[PDB]
């Protein structure tokens, strides 16, 4: 029997329970966005704004249901409307991570028919982050 560690084992929603994505695996996800005609977009946030929190609720009456701070991240430029080139997306990842090397950065895509984000995953965490485990150390 192995025990799932509660210490410094924060996750990041979709795909964070898999081994870290290789460049080839990120590229295949981008192909999937393009093949489906979805709108690619990058978002980023500094370390303190990366995880869901409650601070604003101090100002609330009894209305905190489904309210969390840090759901919104900062948009990198604009959603790439009409983009059919995977290389264009990959270049924007490089550009975004170059400008903000100490930020959390995630790639997302939007469907405009349903009007909802239809996919998303983390592409960069700061190298100073200590709150996560490598796959083989998630249980002990």
């Amino acid at each position: 029997m192995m025990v799932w560690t509660p210490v410094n084992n924060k996750m990041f929603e979709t795909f964070s329970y898999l081994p870290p994505l290789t460049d080839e695996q990120i590229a295949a996800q981008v192909d999937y966005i393009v093949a489906n005609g979805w709108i690619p977009c990058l978002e980023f946030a500094e370390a303190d704004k990366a995880y869901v929190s409650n601070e604003s609720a101090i100002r609330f009456g009894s209305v905190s249901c489904l309210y969390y701070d840090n759901r919104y991240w900062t948009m990198w430029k604009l959603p790439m409307f009409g983009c059919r080139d995977p290389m264009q997306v990959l270049r924007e990842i490089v550009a975004c991570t170059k400008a903000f090397p100490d930020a959390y950065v995630r790639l997302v895509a939007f469907d405009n028919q349903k009007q909802v984000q239809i996919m998303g995953f983390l592409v960069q965490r700061p190298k100073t982050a200590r709150d996560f485990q490598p796959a083989n150390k998630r249980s002990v």
Binding site: M1, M2, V3, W4, P6, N9, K10, M11, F12, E13, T14, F15, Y17, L18, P19, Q25, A28, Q29, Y32, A50, Y51, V52, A57, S62, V63, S64, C65, L66, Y67, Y68, R71, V108, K114, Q115, V116, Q117, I118, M119, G120, F121, D131, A135, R138, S139
Partner: protein, 465 residues
Amino acid sequence: AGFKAGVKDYRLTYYTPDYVVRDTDILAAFRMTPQPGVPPEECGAAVAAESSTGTWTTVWTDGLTSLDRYKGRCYDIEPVPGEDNQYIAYVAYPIDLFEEGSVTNMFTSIVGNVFGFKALRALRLEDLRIPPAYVKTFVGPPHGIQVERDKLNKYGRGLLGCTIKPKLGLSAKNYGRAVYESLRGGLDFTKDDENVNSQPFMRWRDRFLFVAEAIYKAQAETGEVKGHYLNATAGTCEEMMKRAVCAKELGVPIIMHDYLTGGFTANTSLAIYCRDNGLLLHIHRAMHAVIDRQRNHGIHFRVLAKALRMSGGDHLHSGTVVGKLEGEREVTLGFVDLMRDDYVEKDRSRGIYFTQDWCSMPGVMPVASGGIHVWHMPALVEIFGDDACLQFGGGTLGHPWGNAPGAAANRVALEACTQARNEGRDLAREGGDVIRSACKWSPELAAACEVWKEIKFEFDTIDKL
């Protein structure tokens, strides 16, 4: 044309095969088995009459109103291939017949009395055409698929749930203990079992509080939004509301309701409350199979599903196809569309008798639950896509290493299949390989795969098309 006392055939007034349906009419498709020596026309006409304006003998009060304007109409009768004494009778009900916003009233007319008639042997409501003009009178689901995903900040994969077990008998503290351990391993949701309400072994408010602690601990630990469907199902509306109020005051995301055992009137009330206070509402379909299992008699689930969508619910159980409970593949795909989509075309090979226009009413998230485990993951992702919630009760609390590893196993399997589909792999055919690759990689998953490898649920399907 005066008042003439006495009995005459229903078909004289209620069988109108030349009638052109109106875009505002409610349409019903009944599977009808008449008694020997009762013509299909008269049987369909009886069903139309006694679910709209007529009774067994002529009444004088007809003259005071306009039967033409209000009467239900059997406008078409279809033979059923392979059956000597079974027909699809189509009935059209003018919009004036129904109370705005009331599934209760719609059910009271259309399925109220006709199923008990001596003149028929069996009757089944297969489908309903709810016209846009009527759909617009309903508040509908509190949030729906898009808003839910937006509030939970979850995209790009199916949601993962889990029913705490044993069904009954656990104390509030242990309930919270089981909830914390399941959520912290990668499940988005856990839930009260449908019959967990308030009982001697566990009172509801004790549970709600410990569960809140568990939710907030798991959330802090994982940095992902977590929830637990707290059951508001109760004996009275007052009790139901008290429980919803407490959830609201704990700031938790989601509650649940058993809409058939609680009822449509209670459920609408709860949906409206959930709308006004920003709670997600998970709907359990307890009792549905009493109504919808048999091919010859009852109401098909797709109608019960339509009814729920109108009444209000952000989630509704859809069946699994592959688990412990019945649900045929094509029929399921048909009502999943009716639950989720804005517009669904007539498609008799999936049981869809009518084109259904939902006129922008939010979609309901299907919930696949009951007897599923990790090896079912590929099939589940392939049937439902991302817009679904997949629940592993036994498939989590039955893991040899406990709830947290159990959850991680399910989470790994879901994400592995999702990644594989996104890369262009066929989950219908490469499903086993995807799971096996993940096994050699994740020990938690390996342990789950080993324990449930030989477990299948393959029986002859009762509810056929």
